[PDB]
């Protein structure tokens, strides 16, 4: 042991040191350790990305799993220290009577108390999380305070590296002795053991050491080690960290959507100014705001946007969804960093009982398996969970009303007629689902603690419980951001589009105005004025916009001035009504199709904008495709590919490639 | 390093421990004077602002070097108005769709102070108004946000809000209305502008027009006839969330210390294991919050006289002592740690929105230009009291827990059932009626544990399809901190209970050893002329079979013969008597066995009753080992500073009488200095791990 730190002897200092960067280089490095092929562990440098890599993979093949030899003479030392206690007299007041080895069989019995179904209706834990729980066990017991036998830790281990997990019990820990049971109860040999190999075949105890390639035959457990493997929060707290990596990396996520909710809405980006978010003081709003600003510095939707700043007093300020997207953000990112951190404290921690602490010669007994850390950040996180959900509605909400989303179609639909395309109403009700049930989630499960065994556990984190309910609400915020990613792209082809038919129909009118009319200046500022889907299913029609202003323009002008007058009104209504409902209808036809087919005379602005990698990784990588009830494609199915594209880790290169040129400063704004 | 999102500076203020955290927040909250620039209001002075009545108990002062800065931002507004516009709620209009342009800028603010005027007073006293308190609080962290020189409103209206405050008028305001807070904020500007319905109240409590109120606060010049921006400058803002918000977290910072405290008494009264308290279990898990609790409470047991005794006892008897300590005790570092990391974050948060600039848009007259932006939504607020509402919680769950443990006669290690103090358990219910109460307080504590921010509604024209609802979250945990209180209160004079039944039972079982040894020399010793090792090696095992047994339950009719005293004592004698040969000694050794049991009945219930008259009259033989611990301060100010008396069914007085004394003292402040003072001689350190 230690002597105090005298700079920070309660560890408060060190603790914050972990908070002191910004929330995107740590999110980078967890990635990065989420991508390595080997874990490496020792009892205090396990991090959220690393639970993450071992959880998902199947095997060694995926990632392997590696113990630090420099760790094996401290394990041995504790649990050579129980064995000669034992061996000369006996001491140990929570480890030892007369029969000892029926002492650790009798443990193990009695806490296999799960109820397992038939083991595949929903009552066995993903082997998924029990990967996860077998990881952070190993490298909770490295740190040589628990007295167990580094040969356990190593079979484990070969557990983890072929793929042959554990089956558990879904429920019943308070934390995590019945579940972790489940483990010591394989490792002895228990008659009702079983597990799953990497193709999912269930075996019992035996074959599955066969099949692991673990040798000795079972183990027969000394004083100790029974306590050792059971007492712990191993599987509320690995859960809890797998979770936090998915957390992460989403809340990154709904920062950088909320900059193309901007391009694509045509919002004013003043909203991200430094300054704005400097003198309110929280970082989070602070690096919120600066990520979206550096997207929207690098987009070509603003830099066209700004040019429609110079000819348009009637406009309307940005809703809040918008406007404020950095200050809603930013504290739930906070929250979220301070949950990881906690949480990675967790999996580093000591946490069976009693403590075996060899300098000192004494068993310690304790508290450090009330996994309370667990219980507190899940809940916490789960809160600011459903608190982005409900900003990624609200953006969605906006996106796909026409009253709202600034010149955009109805429900985002893409077809030349509007009556047989009625986009992403079906998607909107579905996020409305979503976000009810997040919202749901989103209470937390510690304030419903029971009085438990005897009343001898009158408090008990529920930290497992916690974090299955968080790991629930992070599969909705994955819906809900599949779902709104699909919606972005057609936002950005329906804006590309746009464009292409508004400079058909100014060249148009300009030509055909020259022929007949031989005021150019103000019948092109009156094409400004209209949104090109108010008119551009039937652009002749003398009852849409497009006719009924253009014919006004010319009215207004032969009214104020000129009288026959050359026969004015003879040259509006025949020449040059006639003539462009001869040529209207064709030209825009072919802007169309120009943009279907890729060869567009005004190129898509994303392919010049930062948030292009989102794009590509959609269209190109996915091959969802622009959605209209012209075809047959449901948007399920794109939902559906991006969804599988989220939980395979694809969307994480693109979207850190949006801020692959950011410096991590915000723009100077002292002058 | 370079700290350019400003994580840097936000960690920092998490460094340094809890308590010294605490102690300066106290200190701040006792400064007679709070001189606010828009920068450095803390929550210990808004808590001082918002108790006191007027300037006479604490007094707000405004930094005339903000002046300047007030001022250029207040005129470039005027000069760009005179010969321009196009700035939001200025010259144009509020909310959704606000395409509406107006050249009336003085009527524009008229009737922005009318429509936010839409809340609901009810009759004035029937539960629909703000507290004055928050009123008064709201008022403070209103001016401190509009200090920092970047909200255009005129330094002269700041000094009115100043009178209002060190005057004592409070104006009315709604209680609800607000998603966060222009329809509260706007009772304020309207009465600052003479609005016919404003009205406002004095230190006294009397309801007074604005006129009436401008005469009593010596506001000169009349009403206010508001600038183009100073409208939304006074009603834009987080200023009524964040401010109760700041009130709050005083008191929850103040009450998690607490909760470690009355955890370390907890485990003197109830003859605990201090170990677990060290430091390695701690350190081993990294988590600050739990090693800070744990060296809290190791510091209060290293300094306990009840567990310096309870190790001398365990050296002469190593056996016995088997049973271990339940949750609630063995783990209650663990269980706070992770609550107080929680309350300290929401507790920086609430201070850096208390010293923001949270008004539309935002004058920066170095670039001259209007930010447009989203500085209103109040979301640190709501986040940080869910968090916070959730940890308080947890923490009155423990206190549940703990409470349960020690009023339970099955649980508290030798106290008595319901800690009743009576002679006669049979008419003592003791704490059975509080200990229902403590039930009830916890599962609507439990039940306010829920958040608010998962009930955003889409507001105004779906404008505001995001909000934070700060000020109603406030609310909430405004409320929790009043159930935890009332635990608080309940948990300490059952403490303080415990004390003197420590106390008591201490100072009966030695008069029955002392009585028991002196009868057992006088009968089995007097044999000795022909039985000299019979019952000789026994009188130290008399006092073992005494010390194995609880006091309470002989203590009333001590020498009956069928309560644990006497059927004990027989046992011993007997058993002693027939195995170590009764046929040596057959005839005389029974006999002087019923002789030792009627001398001892004629004189042991006068001697322990002997010993509960002098334990009452304050004249016991064994001193109460309270006054030689730590943790005195807390009893001392229970019994001598509030007047609680040790409660019996022999007296009049009811439980809720001594836990209302209580309850009071907390909210009265008097509660801060004696929980205090239990740590005065900590160092902040844990004690050495490596020898
Ligand atoms: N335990
Ligand atoms: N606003």
Redesign the interface.
């Known amino acids: ?4 730190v005298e700079s920070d ?9 972990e ?5 995107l280089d740590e999110v980078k490095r967890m990635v990065a350790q989420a991508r390595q092929p080997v874990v490496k562990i020792e009892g205090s440098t396990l991090r959220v990305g690393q639970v993450a890599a071992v959880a998902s993979a199947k095997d060694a093949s995926g990632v392997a799993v590696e113990l630090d030899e420099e760790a094996r003479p401290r394990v041995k030392a504790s649990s050579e220290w129980i064995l000669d206690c034992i061996a000369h007299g006996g001491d140990i ?2 480890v030892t009577t007369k029969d000892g080895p029926a002492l650790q069989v009798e443990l193990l019995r009695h806490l296999n108390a799960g109820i397992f179904g038939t083991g595949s209706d929903g009552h066995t834990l993903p082997s998924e999380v029990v990967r996860a729980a077998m990881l952070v066990r190993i490298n909770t017991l490295l ?1 040589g ?1 628990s007295g167990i036998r580094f040969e356990i830790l190593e079979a484990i281990t070969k557990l983890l590296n072929t793929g042959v997990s554990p089956c558990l019990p879904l429920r019943g820990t308070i934390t995590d002795l019945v579940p972790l049971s489940y483990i010591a109860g394989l490792i002895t040999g228990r008659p009702n053991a079983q597990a799953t190999t990497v193709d999912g075949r269930k075996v019992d105890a035996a074959e599955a050491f066969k099949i692991a390639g673990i040798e000795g035959g079972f183990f027969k457990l000394n004083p100790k080690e029974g306590l050792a493997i059971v007492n712990g929060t191993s599987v509320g707290s690995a859960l809890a960290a797998t979770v936090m990596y998915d957390a992460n990396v989403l809340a990154v996520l709904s920062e950088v959507l909320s900059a193309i909710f901007c391009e694509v809405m045509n919002g ?1 980006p ?2 991200t ?1 430094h ?9 989070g709003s ?2 919120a705001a ?1 990520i979206m600003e550096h997207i929207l510095d690098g987009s070509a939707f603003m830099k066209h946007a700004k040019k429609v700043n110079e000819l348009d ?5 940005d ?3 918008l ?6 953000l ?3 990112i ?2 979220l960093r ?1 949950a990881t951190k ?1 949480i990675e ?2 999996v ?4 069976d009982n009693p ?1 075996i ?1 060899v ?2 010669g004494k068993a ?7 996994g ?2 667990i219980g ?2 899940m ?2 996180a789960r ?2 969970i ?2 982005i959900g ?2 990624m509605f ?1 953006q969605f ?2 996106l796909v009303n026409e009253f ?1 989303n600034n010149g955009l179609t109805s429900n985002l639909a893409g077809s030349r007629n509007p009556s047989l395309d009625y986009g992403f109403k079906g998607t909107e009700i579905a996020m409305a689902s979503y976000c009810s049930e997040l ?2 989630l ?3 499960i ?4 029971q ?1 438990a065994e005897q ?6 984190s529920l930290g497992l419980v916690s974090a299955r309910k968080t790991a629930e609400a992070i599969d909705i915020l994955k819906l809900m951001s599949s779902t709104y990613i699909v919606a972005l792209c057609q936002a950005i082809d329906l804006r590309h589009l746009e464009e292409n038919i508004k400079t058909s129909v100014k060249n148009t009118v300009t030509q055909v105005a020259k022929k007949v009319l031989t005021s150019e200046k103000e019948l092109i500022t009156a094409i400004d004025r209209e949104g090109v889907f108010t008119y551009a299913e039937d652009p002749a029609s003398a009852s849409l916009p497009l006719m009924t202003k253009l014919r006004a323009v010319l009215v207004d002008h032969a009214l104020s001035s000129g009288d026959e007058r050359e026969p004015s009104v003879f040259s509006k209504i025949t020449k040059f009504e006639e003539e462009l409902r001869a040529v209207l209808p064709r030209e825009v036809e072919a802007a169309r199709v120009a943009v279907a087919e890729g060869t567009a005379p005004v190129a898509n602005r994303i392919a010049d904008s930062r948030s292009f990698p989102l794009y590509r990784f959609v269209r190109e990588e996915l091959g969802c495709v622009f959605l209209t009830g012209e075809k047959l494609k449901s948007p399920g199915e794109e939902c559906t590919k991006v969804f599988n594209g989220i939980n395979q880790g694809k969307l994480v290169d693109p979207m850190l490639e949006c801020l692959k040129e950011w410096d ?3 723009l100077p ?3």
């Open positions: 042991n230690g002597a105090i002897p309660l560890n408060w200092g060190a603790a914050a040191a908070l002191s960067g910004s929330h007041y929570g740190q305070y004013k003043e909203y100014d300054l704005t978010h400097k003198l309110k003081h929280h970082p602070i690096e600066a007093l009637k406009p309307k300020q809703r809040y969804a406007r404020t997207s950095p200050q809603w930013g504290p739930q906070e929250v301070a906690s404290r967790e580093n921690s000591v946490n403590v602490d300098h000192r310690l007994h304790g508290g450090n398996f009330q309370t850390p507190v950040s809940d916490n809160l600011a459903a608190n409900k900003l609200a909400s906006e709202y919202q749901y989103g209470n937390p510690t304030n419903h603690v009085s009343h001898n556990q009158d408090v008990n991590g400063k915000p704004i002292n002058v």
